[PDB]
Amino acid sequence: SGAIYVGNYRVVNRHLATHNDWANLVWEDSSRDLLVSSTTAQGCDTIARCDCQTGVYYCSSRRKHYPVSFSKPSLIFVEASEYYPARYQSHLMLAVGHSEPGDCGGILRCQHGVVGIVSTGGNGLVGFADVRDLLWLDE
């Protein structure tokens, strides 16, 4: 589990979004596993606007933060699941690191702020849904 609170928005994994998220929907994209809903309070997370390929992520299955090198946002094949058929997920960045399904929502951050959230994993690899291109989260 896990979300990004910036301004009047809440950013979560689309496959984990609540009824409240869908009732206050701003934008969703199944191909990125992202959903953004509106909030009544002011979130204080800062979004990074950079091309960093190093950062730190929170791994709930280990109650620990891990430093990682990660790839640039790209289209990557993601095996079928209870939430989606087999498909290419866009804007995904991979890193060598531990992850388990309940780890989705863990934040990835660089020295410039929030980079994205855990969205995929499998065989000593963790995938992150990038959020740095969503310039409207700030405005």
Ligand X SMILES: CSc1cc2c(cc1NC(=O)N1CCC[C@H](C(N)=O)C1)CCC(=O)N2
* Distance of closest approach, residue 43 Cβ to ligand X, in angstroms: 23
Q: Is 7 helix (H, G, I), strand (E, B) or coil?
A: strand
Amino acid at 37: S
Choosing from 15, 29, 45, 98, which is the catalytic residue? 15
Among 36, 68, 121, 128, binds ligand X (CB under 6 A): 121
Choosing from 91, 103, 104, 130, which is the catalytic residue? 104
Closest CA to 130 of 47, 22, 46: 47
Name the site residues for Zn ion (rule: CB under 5 A).
Answer: 48, 50, 52, 110, 112
Strands of the sheet containing 74-78, edge to edge, are 64-69, 54-59, 107-110, 113-121, 125-130, 87-96, 74-78
Q: List contacts with ligand X (CB under 6 A).
A: 15, 33, 78, 81, 83-84, 89, 99-101, 103-104, 118-122
Annotated binding-site residues for Zn(2+) read: 50, 52, 110, 112
